[PDB]
């Protein structure tokens, strides 16, 4: 149609083409214009002319007030970080140095810089630079501690709710508890002095910290406490933040009726306000796909991580931890979904991507690098079985052995010996030893895996049953201890149908194993007794398979706020 360009979009391209002469005068332009000049520099690809200005804190304070075009700033910021220049670490250090100089000032200048820190530290934390956002908040925190009145106590607890969030994406859990304890010190002081603070966002972080350390018993306790303080006056960003973390603790609690209403309300609440492109919406989808994968709704769990990844791949550039986290979970979901098929080439690409990103931006001994490392190892051991080349079978299976042990060490260093995540690596390493023909070694890993999970989770739980089936296949298919395997298969059968029914698609490896269990010990009557149940499993799975996609399952306005909270709280 050949429509001419607006005079604005023409004057933008004429001051950018004359940027060297006009760099001094551009910084004096209004915020809406100034960001559009800088975004034009990114569009032209002149990142050096741009990162020379974002490294200054004052300019990055001006381009942080453009809230409409923040989604363009994240892609412009992430492009700088991959370009070279450490624009995140320079901004965080340049703020801490400037923040440390106004300690001997009044409460007007200090509140000006604290608000800069809350939008800068609120941006680096949003872009994934948790190790660099914490340095901003730790400087904002020490501004609130200087003045000990009722006014600044509400900001010190506003830093500690954010410090507790940048210390979980950075997997610094052992500092998280000390942060929460310091928050209560600034909460009890404020609450006692005739001013009650909303303790809803802060307890939501503990619903993810204690979830991360596999304290699901403690996670659900703070899940209830978080939602008891949900008020309609809270920001939607805070409210959707509590819901997604509350869902993750409820799903791992293996109760799914209360879990769906929390996260489907969260996805709706993060889609009507934030829209289908804001990273927070994709953040909710990532936790929504956690619900789908644990309820055996694996078919549409891949489609919700792919949606979650595609949002983050557009807002958060190439090499970002948030993109890498989506690559990790999508690789795991594609691993689970296509486990039966045995084809892992898209899943391997996603798992390899999540390591090519995290190893670039995180140290070699980071906990989040360990969880993303186990997913490649799970994929590698299946390729090391499906491939028919013995040389490839041995070497690829050995590579997956170094990844689990490296992943186990990082989990064992921070989560301790007695945790589900540490035991989750024992079970994965147990399955690997089964494929490595080390059936003697595979016995003691699963025994240590079940004993840790049984002691912590309980005698009957979904995670315990899924670990037993790993041991049951060991005692049945390649160790010939059918008497020992007889109770193990039955143990997982009861738990498997306890929370999913007979149509649980994971029972295929449980029912078929029972058929091979009875094939070598006689009693062929029970072979047909389990043979029709496998057909019953076939009938009860494909009939319920036909269901609409979860993206439209939430639809438009399914329920209302302050109603899902009350419905969940009373139950």
């Amino acid at each position: 149609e050949w429509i001419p360009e607006t005079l604005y979009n023409t004057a933008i391209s004429a001051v950018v083409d004359n940027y060297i002469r006009s760099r001094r005068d551009i910084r004096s332009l209004p915020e809406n214009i100034q960001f559009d000049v800088y975004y034009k520099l990114y569009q032209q690809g002149r990142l050096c002319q741009l990162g020379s200005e974002f490294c200054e804190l004052e300019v990055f304070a001006k381009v942080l007030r453009a809230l409409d075009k923040r989604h363009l700033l994240h892609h412009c910021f992430q492009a700088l970080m991959d370009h070279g220049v450490k624009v995140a670490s320079v901004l965080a250090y340049s703020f801490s140095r400037r923040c440390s100089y106004i300690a001997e000032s009044d409460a007007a200048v200090k509140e000006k810089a604290i608000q800069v820190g809350f939008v800068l530290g609120g941006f680096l934390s949003d872009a994934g630079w948790y190790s660099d956002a914490e340095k901003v908040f730790l400087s904002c925190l020490q501004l609130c501690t200087l003045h000990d009145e009722m006014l600044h106590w509400f900001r010190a607890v506003e830093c500690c709710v954010r410090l507790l969030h940048v210390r979980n994406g950075n997997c610094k859990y052992h500092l998280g508890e000390e942060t929460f304890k310091l928050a209560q010190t600034y909460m009890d002081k404020l609450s006692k002095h005739g001013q009650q603070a909303n303790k809803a966002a802060l307890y939501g972080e503990l619903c993810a910290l204690l979830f991360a350390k596999s304290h699901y018993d403690e996670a659900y306790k703070w899940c209830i406490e978080a939602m008891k303080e949900i008020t309609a006056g809270l920001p939607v960003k805070v409210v959707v933040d509590v819901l997604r973390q509350a869902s993750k603790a409820c799903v791992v609690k293996r109760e799914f009726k209360k879990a769906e209403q929390l996260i489907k309300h969260a996805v709706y609440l993060a889609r009507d306000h934030f829209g289908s492109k804001h990273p927070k919406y994709s953040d909710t989808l990532l936790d929504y796909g956690f619900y789908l994968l644990n309820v055996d709704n694996i078919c549409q769990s891949v489609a919700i991580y792919q949606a979650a990844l595609d949002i983050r791949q557009s807002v958060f550039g190439g090499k970002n931890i948030h993109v890498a986290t989506a690559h990790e979970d999508l690789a795991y979901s594609s691993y689970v979904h296509q486990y039966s098929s045995g084809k892992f080439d898209n899943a391997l690409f996603h798992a390899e991507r999540a390591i090519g990103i995290i190893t670039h931006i995180l140290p070699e001994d980071h906990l989040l690098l360990a969880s993303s490392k186990r997913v490649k190892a799970l994929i590698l051991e299946e390729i090391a079985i499906d491939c028919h080349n013995k040389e490839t079978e041995q070497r690829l299976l050995q590579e997956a052995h170094d990844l689990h042990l490296s992943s186990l060490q990082l989990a064992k260093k921070a989560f301790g010996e007695f945790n589900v995540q540490t035991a989750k690596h024992y079970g994965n390493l147990g399955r690997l030893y089964q494929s490595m023909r080390k059936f003697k070694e595979a016995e003691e890993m699963h025994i240590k895996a079940i004993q840790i999970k049984e002691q912590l989770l309980g005698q009957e739980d979904y995670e315990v049953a899924l670990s037993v089936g790993h041991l049951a296949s060991l005692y049945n298919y390649d160790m010939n201890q059918y008497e020992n395997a007889e109770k193990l298969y039955l143990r997982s059968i009861a738990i498997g149908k306890k929370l999913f029914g007979e149509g649980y698609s994971g029972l295929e490896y449980d029912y078929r194993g029972l058929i091979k269990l009875y094939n070598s010990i006689g009693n062929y009557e029970k072979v047909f007794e389990y043979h029709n149940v496998l057909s019953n499993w076939n009938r009860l799975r494909d009939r319920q398979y036909s269901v609409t996609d979860a993206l439209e399952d939430v639809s438009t306005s399914p329920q209302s706020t302050e109603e899902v909270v009350q419905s969940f709280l009373i139950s």
């Binding site: 486990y339 045995g342 899924l466 089936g469 790993h470 994971g506």
Partner: peptide, 7 residues
């Protein structure tokens, strides 16, 4: 395939 989905 006999060990179900890896945890």
């Amino acid at each position: 395939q006999k060990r179900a989905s890896g945890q």
